[PDB]
Ligand binder design. Structure first.
Ligand SMILES: O=C(Cc1cccc(Cl)c1)Nc1cncc2cnccc12
Ligand SMILES: O=C(Cc1cccc(Cl)c1)Nc1cncc2cnccc12
Lengths: 304, 304
């Protein structure tokens, strides 16, 4: 029992982290096979970050201008290319610690672990979610760019995020490993609108099932609702609309607890309309939305 | 910016996890140098867990009865001994992945990362604290015994916890790496009193400084207090008494924000007396106590 914001073990990702320096800018890179992936803003100075022409800036750079260090040893750069907002530096050596991996573009509401890094060295690991507004609420300081987000299935690391930017609001924006930003963000030092951040309804329901599984049941009520009645409440409280696809994914948790998904929706409706009245659920005084149904099952079953 | 419940990167610990089986019981072990450390209840069946005489039970066991598997390869056991509540299995091979390490017994209020494991395989990592009542609020299922808690300083892993037991209340009890339980717990299937769990006052103040550093300042007030006035409030709200030792450790955070420690205490006093009024601090609707002053500085500075 017990329920925690749990990250995947980060070892497989630690073995891929390297330091990339170009000119006077240093950030993190991801070494997989003979390629190092990093944010393309590594070629920028603070001056051209205002309005950068990345193609024109990259023309002034050669393979020898990209310094890639793995621990204390230097990697020889034999190629460089730009794919969207990432640079791919071909090195002459394959990373001996390259795990089985895939590049995946996650959907909003999905969760992932982040290995925050500075100077190619890992500092910590935390769990977070891609927000409906395509930002992440991370914890990142200057030098953290190039830190990656990932999920792990048995021995395979699915890289889903690369950190690039912090918005003036203190929230984070980044790309998938093909260099495509999540959301409307551009890699420019210009104020950018994040957008309304709604609550991930299916994840709150998954966490409510996690609460029942671990003993917290005070919020269970004698009511039920329908998808349309529930969604009227969800709209009012800036929660994502719940669909039959969401109900279907909550099936295993509904079967584990014997609580029909619409009955759990009625519990959520009452919690939204009445608040928690000073009570807690899984050590939290608010409704948690950064655990997916898969996360709850994985944590409550022990998948390694 | 951003503040997260961040764990240390777990790679150094993953390389030490092994599976230990004795009879029909399988749990995790920690392989460092040529020794495998595991909870001594690995020698028990469910029947003798009611009242085990570990010395008499260990007499029926030989080196060949302890099956130690590292990944898919078997370790040869050449020695076994019991130290308090842990078994030390001497193996014929030193772990090639043994990091620089120390065994430390942490104080209540201190935090650490946990690498939850099942069958010698890591499933996830989370941050937690040794509670004032010497329990930890972990997330552990059957088979998680032998999973360890740790801190990392540059390249050195300080192992501080080994998981042994879940109390009927769903909270967790374990030992240091010398096999001494934290708190009054015994390794027996008997109901055991955890004790009153108070809030780690110095950690809540550290998290309030973390909130100011990251922009959340609504709770800052025009008041101050004294240690004795504050402690009257702390006693009333089941918070640990604050001492000058606690004020001294909050020095760097007080210097970073320009907020005197007793002024921050007055903010905490008002939050305790008035609640949060439906507001949040660092994405939380309650006062967080599982970040030490060291954790806040480390996260807000980027120590790798
Ligand atoms: O945001 C940037 C630099 C930047 C500026 C404009 C566009 C782009 Cl793509 C990147 N770096 C940081 C990332 N995360 C967190 C930080 C915290 N403090 C300072 C800097 C941080
Ligand atoms: O508590 C025990 C077994 C046990 C019983 C009495 C004494 C001692 Cl030292 C150990 N194992 C578990 C640990 N953590 C979490 C669990 C969750 N579910 C089942 C079992 C768990």
């Amino acid at each position: 029992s017990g329920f925690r914001k749990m990250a995947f073990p980060s070892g497989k990702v630690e073995g891929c982290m390297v330091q990339v320096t170009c000119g006077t800018t240093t950030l993190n890179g991801l070494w997989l096979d003979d390629v190092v992936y990093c944010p393309r803003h590594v070629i920028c100075t603070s001056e051209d970050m205002l309005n950068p022409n990345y193609e024109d800036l990259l023309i002034r750079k050669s393979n020898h201008n990209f310094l890639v260090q793995a621990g204390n040893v230097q990697l020889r750069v034999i190629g460089h290319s730009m794919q969207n907002c990432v640079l791919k530096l071909k090195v002459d050596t394959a990373n001996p610690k390259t795990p089985k991996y895939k590049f995946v573009r996650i959907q909003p509401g999905q969760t992932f672990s982040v290995l925050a890094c500075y100077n190619g060295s890992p500092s910590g690991v935390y769990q977070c979610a891609m927000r409906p507004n395509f930002t992440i609420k991370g914890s990142f300081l200057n030098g953290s760019c190039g830190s990656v987000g990932f999920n792990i299935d048995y021995d395979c690391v699915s890289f889903c995020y690369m950190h690039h930017m912090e918005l003036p609001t203190g929230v984070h924006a980044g790309t998938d490993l093909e260099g495509n930003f999540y959301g409307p963000f551009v890699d420019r030092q210009t104020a950018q609108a994040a957008g309304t951040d709604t609550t991930i309804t299916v994840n709150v329901l998954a966490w409510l099932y996690a609460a029942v599984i671990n003993g917290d049941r005070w919020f269970l009520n004698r009511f039920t609702t329908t998808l349309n009645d529930f969604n009227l409440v969800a709209m009012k409280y800036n929660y994502e609309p719940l669909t039959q696809d969401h109900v279907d994914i909550l099936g295993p948790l509904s079967a584990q607890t014997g609580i029909a998904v619409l009955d759990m929706c009625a519990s959520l409706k009452e919690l939204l309309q009445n608040g928690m009245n000073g009570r807690t659920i899984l050590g939290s005084a608010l409704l948690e939305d950064e655990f997916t149904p898969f996360d709850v099952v994985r944590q409550c079953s022990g998948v390694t």
